[PDB]
Design a protein around this ligand. Structure first.
Ligand SMILES: [Zn+2]
Ligand SMILES: [Zn+2]
Ligand SMILES: [Zn+2]
Ligand SMILES: [Zn+2]
Lengths: 198, 193, 198, 196
DNA sequence: CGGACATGTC
DNA sequence: GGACATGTCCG
DNA sequence: CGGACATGTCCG
DNA sequence: CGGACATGTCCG
């Protein structure tokens, strides 16, 4: 079993926070975020845009790390990883190791860490300021198993934790959101939002 | 020595409530109001509800502790039997020797009392969620009452105490527990009698 | 071709199969449909298959079972357990974890991966009926659902049962479709309901 | 890896004998010839007879060892359950983890094997008394077959071997054991199921 | 085992 | 959005 | 002693 | 599940 990372929102000295697109709940949607639940619903291997918003600009060398943990405390000390089938299915993007649930796409400077000591997986990219005319920096994440994958997540909900860190891995900022990876994100978002009514 | 089992509703009008789940031979947890007794299966979810007339201050804590019901056994610490103490069933948070765990709460804290040696488990008190009239804690009991070398078919009470952040008494309630393979079946053998 | 033959034939001992008549209660553990020649059964539950002969074959006769895919486009693919169930802790101490079909309650059981085809099979000595019985019952178990991703993945299989002499020469064969599923009764009823026109 | 359980009467014609016993509900110890199985209560005397055609040499010893009968459990060392191992019920000679004890014999030795981790108990072989045909050892079994964390409802075999003073095998036999609260009841049940 | 429903595919 | 295929939970 | 009962387990 | 049972404990 592994110690548990903090999931506490920390805006830090750069005013670090997250943003998400507004996508709707049509059954045709590949990734959609629920503000009410602070929860992303997405399809396996489809683009999940996460926006990085800051008040001041973090210094060059700053990195952005994403890590999954189980949301339920009775599972939180268990490492999150891909199921046996998907680990073997060779849908490699050329850089992500097969065991990793979360990938980043479109970024040559991506790095994957399979930690020596907690054994937890994470994916990290250098922080980049927003492009010209933009208020935020967007990272494209992929989740490589469904929440239901037997022998992996096994229908257990996860949280993704996003940390802004310095070149030595010291904490600068943190935010998190729950994720469900599922076949029909629009439908499932609607169901969980309806259950919130309750 | 023996921890108090005396009902004390206190200034917050603290009371316990239980799900009314009926008596199927193997329902996972059921409660008998006639006996004030919870019948539950080993390691399964055992909801216990905290009902208050007014909200205790934040920092308030909710502790649970098992004692033997019968006078001749009351001074003996309630613990898991030698077999279950050694099984591979740690949730990563709870001591393997503790009978009572709480599931679903990352702020769970476990105590072996340095003086009495008794085991207990504590969580922060939180008020009920919107739409709810009570706070539910999910307890697990990790041995059957019948376990040889543990409870050995001796009945226990669970004592639930409401405490301030320093451990001062704010409220107390309790209930008898039978942990068994067939809670529905057994509830009756005490409720058909 | 190289696909093993599935062609039913009784041969000189008048070899054929019988099944229990278990009905269609929703979650019955194993049931057989004569209209479909199809067994419906739950993962890892006892599946009684009866061997009936008109005359007793010789000492050293053996009885082999093998799965193949029923659809022509999948027939050349070896039927194996999915990676999840392969790696799960459900061993009986005898079966290879990769094998779909086990025999329970028989210490003389032997498992084969084919030299040339790599197809899996399970074989036991033929024994004549017990005193007072007219058939020999073998207890099979199927160790993945038809639905298992990374395994059968929703493709139908047939089970081929062969009676063989001690050198492996064929003496008789019978095949039947198998659906391994959570609700054998439900699914049998549904499939037979779907035979008729409105 | 399992010690052999193969019956080996050897050059001394080594056999075992058991009282012709009854099937009263809680008789302390009872052998089933039909099952080659002893049914006995925890900690009660279990007499076992040694029968030989030719007497073994001086320094011969008699060893008893339990193994699980069922093939998928055979690799596992038979030991007492965590509760009984900690019960303090030693007779002064048997280490507490050992399932099988010998009563009434101060020359008993208990072995914890450093290579195999199997437990066994061994006594010197003594020829039958005058006008006696056989030698009786009194064994005790210190967990029920049911004990969770120990045998856990798994049937066991007891293997009795004759060995020379250096531990070389002279003969071997075996029998099934159920340790249980009601040996006669269970004998009957198991013998009824024999018909099925 | 199996009503209710979770969750995937056509 | 849709109907269904086909699984798990907990009594 | 056997019967009743307490109480865990499993097939189908 | 639904009983049938497995298996220890208590009483007559
Ligand atoms: Zn997966
Ligand atoms: Zn226990
Ligand atoms: Zn599978
Ligand atoms: Zn024991």
């Amino acid at each position: 079993s592994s110690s548990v990372p903090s999931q506490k929102t920390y805006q830090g000295s750069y005013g670090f926070r997250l943003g998400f697109l507004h996508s709707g709940t049509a059954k045709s949607v590949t990734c959609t975020y629920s503000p009410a639940l602070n929860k992303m619903f997405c399809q396996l291997a489809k683009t999940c845009p996460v926006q990085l918003w800051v008040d001041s600009t973090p210094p060059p060398g700053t990195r952005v790390r994403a890590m999954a943990i189980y949301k339920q405390s009775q599972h939180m000390t268990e490492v999150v990883r891909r199921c046996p089938h998907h680990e073997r299915c060779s849908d490699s993007d050329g850089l992500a190791p097969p065991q990793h649930l979360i990938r980043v796409e479109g970024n040559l400077r991506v790095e994957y860490l399979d930690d020596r000591n907690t054994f937890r997986h994470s994916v990290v990219v250098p922080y980049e300021p927003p492009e010209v005319g933009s208020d935020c920096t967007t990272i494209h994440y992929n989740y490589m198993c469904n929440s239901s994958c037997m022998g992996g997540m096994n229908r257990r909900p996860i949280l993704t934790i996003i940390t802004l860190e310095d070149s030595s891995g010291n904490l600068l900022g943190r935010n998190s959101f729950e994720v469900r990876v599922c076949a029909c994100p629009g439908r499932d978002r609607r169901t969980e939002e309806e259950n919130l009514r309750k």
